[model samples]
Target chain A: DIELTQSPATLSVTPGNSVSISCRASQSLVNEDGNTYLFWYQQKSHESPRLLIKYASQSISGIPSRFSGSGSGTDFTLSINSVETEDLAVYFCQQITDWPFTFGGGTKLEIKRADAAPTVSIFPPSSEQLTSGGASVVCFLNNFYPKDINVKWKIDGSERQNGVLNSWTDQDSKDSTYSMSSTLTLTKDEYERHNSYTCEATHKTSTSPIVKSFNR
Target chain B: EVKLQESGPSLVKPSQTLSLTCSVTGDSITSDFWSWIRQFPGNRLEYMGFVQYSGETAYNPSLKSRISITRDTSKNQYYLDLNSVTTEDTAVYYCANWHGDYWGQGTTVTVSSAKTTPPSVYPLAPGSAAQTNSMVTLGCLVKGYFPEPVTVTWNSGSLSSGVHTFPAVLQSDLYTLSSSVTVPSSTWPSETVTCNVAHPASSTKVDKKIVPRD
Candidate 1:
């Protein structure tokens, strides 16, 4: 079996910045027939590790085209074309061709924050706009250095509870990046009456928390 | 459209034997070899072996000791037996007819306490390649018999030296029964690779030409 290892062990990227993780095997895993037995894995905090690519050349099902793998033999690379917030977490590489196989120690991706201060933005700008009125509230995290961040909506300084939330990250150039935006629908009555609404962005690599709040 | 269904218990306790059967419809059991294959939750597909109509069968040499395959023509069903199971064997097992690539709906089997044995091997060839002047490793692989031992040998030109690989007891559908030998490309391209299989019930051999390819 081949032993696998990752470099840097961690990374920070803003929205739109390209991110890459390297997977190196202890031995040459190329078969005599030229088949490379390599695979990349992504493990979410509480979910099963998913196969991102296999054979060091083929993409597994359901993986986006933007995710591509290159290199051969023991040296291989997994590149994500455009980093997104959902892309946060740990990434691993594995060798399946050999027995007693091995997986790389994961690399954690974090959001690069500026000024070490918390930042938050709320849409419609007012709780009155959230009342039983038919309006959509969008909570967005902007200009956040390092796009690898989680944006969440909360009420009165307390974390808002909800089902699954979808998020993405994008970098327009090298310096400008955007995290994710979440939309919440509230009846005009509830929106106008709610005391406070807050949006929080958590950087995986940093302990400092950034939050924005609006009160009517 | 023909369909085969596997019906059995989902969970098996450790050290206990696990048994399941495949019921065939829209086809005669005598016409095709009924086989079993499996997949672990996070693993790839595995081939167990198959049962034939004439009572003649081939099994993955790996599982020959602990795995058995039997057919009941009267009921058009085939049965699988896996003894001394464990938790590592927890996987989805399916009964299939190797009609190229398609397979049947799989039934899940979980072993709670038994330890899974490493896969076994059935020697298919000597350390050699198929083509001359080209280096390639060759081995014989078989699927589907249980409690019966099988042997493979080269039967050409009076050269009869062979090696035997360890055999395994199969717990479920997917098992590997293969042997490995390294051969020089020069001598391999000109000779025929043969696997002579010997079983108590009967004997059979399979052969293939080692062709050189770029």
Candidate 2:
């Protein structure tokens, strides 16, 4: 039975500090081969994920000594010491002890920022995206602090819900702020017509909801 | 204090799913999160996974994708559905709050090969003669089942209250059980009382009817 439960959906910390992510398993992670079947990975925005610790706590080559893992059986923890700005990313724990190769929901590590509010912008769909008889619009919320923000789509100023998808907020490593994107798709008939589309973003830093829109 | 009780099959054939439920009491199901854990025969414990009040879940990787944790807020209960169980999966399963502040009395689930045996439903009889307006009791005996679990119902589930079914007891390799029901004597004379037995090994339901006697 492989079910890896990760805790603390998100963690906000300052540089030079330390933190730990807890991962609990439904079944024992110890294999008969005398190895723990757990791994830790660090994934940054717009970058490939990297493995940090393996076999429950063994440090892999090229990984800093500050990153370590501990615990066995059903409980494990991944610890990061002297939290550097570069460590601002999501961490996930995976288990390969049983079939199906399961993973834990990632724990997003956010660095403390100056409470920067997100800048909202709406982008028209690309030509390739419109080739399938449908047009799409994207809303980007960039450089926000605290990673907690909500975005909604509207048509002609009234809140509408149609073929809309949102992206997970990602940290901008350069500024330590967060960014996310939302897309709304319209049919060929709706896309060719002159209709106003809007993107509304909400963040704690801003007293009013930031609004951005474009006409299709 | 918040309380929990685990209920599920004690015996299951290999390669079958093992389902168990944790019934909560004295608190709202949404007040806290829940988890399922199990301890093998040697006292080795494993945490299966957890479900939040919002229905979000996480599971142990050792179980892979075979374990599912769900909840029934309407009934104040949560359930565990473990698939393709083997003898190694045999353990005492428990349901508990995230912090271990509350727990259910673990239910033992055994996964292995079992002999199929259907229970015999005996005739229903009046526990004792009664007069109108007095309380009347009826009894039914079920025996000779390999697997202990059997469903004994009165009037085909119509009569749910004032009934008691005792746990099965092992005698040799077979199991025996008895269930009883109490009804107001005024309604007994005109009511068609029946004891229905359902066992997984049985091809057809076995039932017995009670006739008013001197």
Candidate 3:
């Protein structure tokens, strides 16, 4: 079995932009028949992945010219030209060069939302709620377009994994922007050990994570 | 539009691999499929294998396990590696466009058994009923060669193609062959024509030039 590593875990691009995704293999993918067994597939959200390229660079029948593949052996690339809004999807590289076919972790392509970015804010537990038992911290995100965003809460810079809750993104009927809320509850031990709680928000329109921190 | 030329050693040991390369000009090797074929001593033909533009191959069934076709995109050339060669593999190997149109000047590979004798190339002479007002036929004799096959080519005026080389005839342990080409009478009188002979057994090439008196 071979493992294919895909690069640029996430790509944010405009409709007219072009992009190339790389897929590297653990070993050469050439078969005894002299043809490589590597292939590329495109999976739109909620849709099955479809073959885009085969044998490294040969296009599947009726595939658009804008999608092309190249490279050989242990390395390969898939290029998309003039990206379209509908092209928002995940691209994956698969190989069957040997027994037990394998696939790469996918690269997600998202439309570069042209509207305002999410405004992130975090609220620490009230003094009264901060008893010797546990306390809750709230992270609020709002005014983001395309209604898509990710939020994470970390204590002392380490992500709080178990006691985190997220609300469904609610779209503003008037402005068409979106808002969401996430809550993290800490045990008495965790609250005493770490005073720093940070909220990290990610969206397609922002170049980096929008980080807000609250410290006791 | 690519031009192919086959090149490699002219001889090989009975049990060694025979390697040859086809250099491509005018187009990238990845633009089209390339193939290798051979003609044995008795004129029997064999389709060895072909490498597609994407480096895929379809080999002759009988040669599937013993042959490999690969390419060097940087050098714009493809190669043939035939393993465990024997006397039966002695043949004129040619590189060609898989479609059978373009071809390389075939190169001969002889298996061992040789202390070669270089053949002598005679000057171009008149052929039977050799001359007319508009046409002229020239003959070249390649004599006293050993281990058989020799390549004969023509360069007369602006003409270099259309040469017809006869099979080698063995006599007293040596071999001889003849080749001829016809050209316009005006071409002969105005230009000195030459016959070039290549003998692989001796690793020698000889050329004879002549300008017949008008």
**Per-residue accuracy of model 1 over A102-126 as CA lDDT, tens digit each:** 5677777665545422234343422
1 against 3, candidate with superior DockQ:
1
Worst 10 residues of 1 chain A by lDDT: A123-132
Which of the predicted structures, 1 or 3, would earn the higher TM-score when compared with the native?
3
Mark the regions of model 1 whose C-alpha exceeds 4 Å error after superposition: A1-216, B99-102, B113-214
Which candidate has the top score in lDDT? 2
Tell me which of candidates 1 and 2 scores higher on lDDT: 2
Going through the candidates in order, the fraction of native interface contacts each one reproduces equals: 0.00, 0.00, 0.00
lDDT, candidate 3, A77-189, per-residue tens? 99999986667777888775664456787887766555878655455554434553656666656667876677877878887777766554323323445556565766667
Q: Which run of 10 residues does model 1 chain B get worst, by summed lDDT?
A: B121-130
Query: What is the interface RMSD, in angstroms, for predicted model 1?
Result: 26.3
User: Distance (Å) between predicted and true CA of A54, model 1?
Assistant: 22
Candidate 3, residues B50-165, lDDT tens digits: the string is 78888888886667488999999998998999898887888888787764446776777877655578886554433222333575656565656777677777773345543445
Clashes in model 3: which pairs? none
Docking class of 2: incorrect
lDDT scores in order = 0.58, 0.73, 0.71
